[PDB]
Write a structure and sequence with these properties.
The structure is cut from a larger assembly and holds chains A (74 residues), B (150 residues), C (120 residues) and D (127 residues). Chain A has 74 residues and is mostly loops. The N and C termini of chain A lie far apart (45 Å). The two termini of chain D are 22 Å apart. Classes of the chains: A little secondary structure (74), B alpha+beta (150), C alpha/beta (120), D alpha+beta (127). Chain D binds four RNA strands through helix 1 and helix 3.
Chain lengths: 74, 150, 120, 127
RNA sequence: AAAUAGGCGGCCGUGGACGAGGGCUCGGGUAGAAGACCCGG
RNA sequence: CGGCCGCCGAGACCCCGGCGCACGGAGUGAUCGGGUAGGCGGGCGUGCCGGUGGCGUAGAAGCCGGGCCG
RNA sequence: CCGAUAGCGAACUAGUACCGUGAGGGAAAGCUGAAAAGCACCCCGGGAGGGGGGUGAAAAGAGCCUGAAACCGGGCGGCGAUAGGAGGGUGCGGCCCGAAAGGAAUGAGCCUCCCCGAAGGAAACCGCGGCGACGCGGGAGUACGAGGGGAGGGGACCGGGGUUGCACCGUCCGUCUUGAAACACGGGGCAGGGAGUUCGCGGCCGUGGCGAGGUUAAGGGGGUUAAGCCCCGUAGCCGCA
RNA sequence: GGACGCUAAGCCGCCCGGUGGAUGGCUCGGCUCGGGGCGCCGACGAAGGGCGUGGCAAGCUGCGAUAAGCCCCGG
């Protein structure tokens, strides 16, 4: 109906198309790294999350019982 | 077609040449020089060039050729091949002209003009295991003569 | 899409109708009701029948610019004209209200509005 | 004519002329287009974008002609391609002009022109 | 070819009439890369 | 250098109409009009499909050159 | 879905030609016309080439349907051997043509009169001042003014195109850059090719259905030539704490 | 003095002929999908490959010196 190309048009001679410079768009370094890109990591490779809180961590605990002994009532 | 219109069996005589292996540059100088003369005069002009006693000036190209005796521009050459080739056309034009009922010995050359045809191409070696184009250009050239008028 | 425009014609016929009333009798309510309809579907009224029973002045004319959503309790006698009713809902205003009627026959009830309160 | 004021203004516009409608250099480069077919400025060296002196008027909103002149030929008549006898109906010498197409056979065309003169419709050329 | 493009003296004109100057030609150079220049015919 | 006087001289500023935008319903704006990065919104063109309605040797498309409109 | 510088490398003697010790690498080349009637016979040409004439169309006459641009030759129109260039833009002259699609002959460029009339706003001469330059009063917001309206005269170009002179202005294009006309980078010229796509998941939004519920997946039955649409299936998910 | 009295070479536009192979129409080909089939064969000497073979044969295709083929049955 609409396509991505339709929305870009052929544009202003931006030659990037909504991501500013054409030198920060050439690969995966540009993203800051591929995937999540460390969290509990000692380097601050990804420093700050995607929310303002910086970074939010994982590896806290509390047991789950075996599925057979549990019941969550209805 | 022909490049200039012909009323061939009653006011013109024509001939044309196809795929003559001859320089374009040399064709330009001859066509330009022969135009406006009579057929007889054209015969005369060719016969002196072939003897190598009448240079035809280049006035359409001018590069890398000395100057020649007296008047007109210095650069010029003897287009021997071209002069021999056109002579054959002239003989044909005349012969056609006898059949048609035209006088064969008074026609003036209104129009003569030369055309860059296909290019016969190939290779000759140059250094470093490289091959370079070795070409001869093939030219078509037309001639149209028209009867005297006043 | 990702930009407004209703494609239900019935809605559009109704929004045009509100405007004619607004210029001619020069009153405010119909003009307010048309804007509410113009707002998104998720910004269209969602009115519960227990929420009718909890808030509303008895005996008066309720206008709802969305859908009325039943399987509750109601016993408050108010007469509702609205853009949509649920099937369940529609039975309940006949039997514990005034009655269910469409929002387009309210033109007939008050041609310029008296005593009517918009309920979001 | 159409009007006196309209006849002046269309003449004033033709004579003045509107932009080139091909940005910068085109005599020198057939690489860049034909004098039709305006391309948006895509330079950073673009003297035309800045609105330089000695390089011409830039296409702007302003250049738009009066509504009467716009969307029509300047004698106010609205063009209809007519390929057949049925299409011809519902034209009027009051606001329409008719265009005969190249394609049209002579047999249908005899019928198109004869009805068209009867209608009072003005035509490209005689008949 | 100083465009303030100069001066003097002499020579000339007046497809489809007639044709003054001039070259190409020839024999050699005082001349000379081509050409030019010069001289004899 | 210190006074003084008359003029020249911008897309400014003024002024007439037109045009867009904003606002007004199912004319109004002293307090509207530059524009890269970037966001937003509208239209055109291209191939094929489907539906609908037409055209062709009494001359299609394409090509070339010219006119006209936006 | 694609269509012969595309889709298989390959639509046509192709994994052929071809290269490399080998392993292995790897192209290009589609189209006469209804029927070949694929040109007898004749002139010329050393000539088998080509030309003249006869060849339904031959501008279908032999990789021949159509036949673009760059480019080459001649010609036409303009300019041109004492005068200056990012090659032009805008105004105004010259020369050049213009059958058509434009506007106008039911009146074109053009000319003339009358009037309205924005912003603006003189002159002659007079008077009085000022060292004078010149100001002030009256003339006078007048004369005058863009633009518009109406009427009239004339009767075929005008627009528009080609080129060129004059006045004025004008240091390409794209990218890089804080700054580009650049001694920063890239471009011989033209044509063709040539770069935002699919899937999953998450977060947004618009529309639409239904509603305290909503939605069915897989499958077979069914229907049909097949199939989609139509009905069954609620497995299972989500919300209702 | 100014005048077209002769301004060649050349510049620009257009025109005509050639060059070139783009463009449109054309397609006995690709490509993808759905259904069904094929679903093994060989020392009882396979597949694959080579070289010949046709009146004229350059390649391809088909065959094996019984050489673009031979025989039998049914259609």
């Amino acid at each position: 109906m609409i396509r991505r190309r339709k929305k870009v048009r052929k544009l202003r001679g931006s030659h990037t198309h909504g991501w500013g410079c054409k030198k920060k768009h050439r690969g995966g370094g540009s993203k800051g790294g591929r995937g999540m890109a460390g969290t509990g990591k000692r380097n601050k490779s990804k420093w700050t999350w995607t929310i303002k809180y910086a970074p939010d961590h994982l590896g806290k605990r509390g047991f789950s019982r075996p599925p057979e002994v549990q019941r969550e009532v209805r | 077609g022909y490049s200039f219109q012909n009323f061939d069996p009653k006011r013109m005589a024509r001939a044309s040449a196809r795929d003559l292996r001859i320089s374009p540059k040399l064709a330009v100088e001859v066509c330009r020089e022969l135009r406006g003369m009579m057929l007889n005069d054209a015969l005369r002009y060719l016969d002196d060039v072939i003897a190598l006693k009448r240079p035809v000036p280049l006035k359409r190209y001018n590069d890398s050729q000395g100057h020649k005796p007296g008047k007109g521009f210095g650069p010029g050459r003897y287009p021997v091949k071209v002069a021999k080739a056109i002579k054959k056309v002239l003989l044909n034009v005349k012969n056609n002209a006898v059949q048609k009922g035209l006088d064969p010995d008074k026609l003036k050359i209104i129009h003569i003009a030369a055309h860059k045809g296909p290019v016969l191409r190939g290779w000759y070696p140059r250094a470093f295991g490289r091959a370079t184009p070795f070409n001869e250009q093939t030219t078509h050239i037309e001639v149209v003569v028209e009867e005297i008028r006043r | 899409m990702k930009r407004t425009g209703p494609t239900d014609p019935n809605l559009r016929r109704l929004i045009r109708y509100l405007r004619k009333k607004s210029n001619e009798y020069g009153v405010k309510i119909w003009k307010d009701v048309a804007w509410r309809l113009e707002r998104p579907r998720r910004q269209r009224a969602e009115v519960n029948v227990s929420k009718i029973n909890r808030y509303a002045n008895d005996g008066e004319m309720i206008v709802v610019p969305g859908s009325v959503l039943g399987a509750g309790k109601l016993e408050k006698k108010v007469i509702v004209a609205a853009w949509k009713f649920s099937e369940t809902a529609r039975r309940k205003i006949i039997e514990a209200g005034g009655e269910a009627i469409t929002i387009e026959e309210l033109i007939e009830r008050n041609p310029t509005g008296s005593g009517v309160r918009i309920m979001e | 004519e159409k009007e006196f004021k309209r006849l002046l203004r269309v003449r004033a516009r033709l004579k003045r002329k509107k932009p080139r409608f091909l940005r910068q250099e085109w005599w020198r480069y057939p690489k860049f287009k034909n004098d039709p077919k305006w391309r948006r400025p895509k330079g950073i060296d673009s003297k035309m974008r800045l609105k330089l002196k000695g390089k011409p008027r830039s296409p702007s909103i302003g250049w738009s002609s009066p509504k009467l002149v716009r969307g029509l030929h300047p004698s106010g008549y609205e063009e209809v391609l007519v390929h057949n006898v049925k299409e011809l109906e519902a034209l009027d010498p009051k606001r329409q002009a008719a265009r005969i197409a190249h394609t049209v056979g002579k047999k249908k065309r005899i019928e198109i022109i004869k009805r068209a003169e009867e209608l009072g419709i003005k035509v490209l050329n005689p008949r």
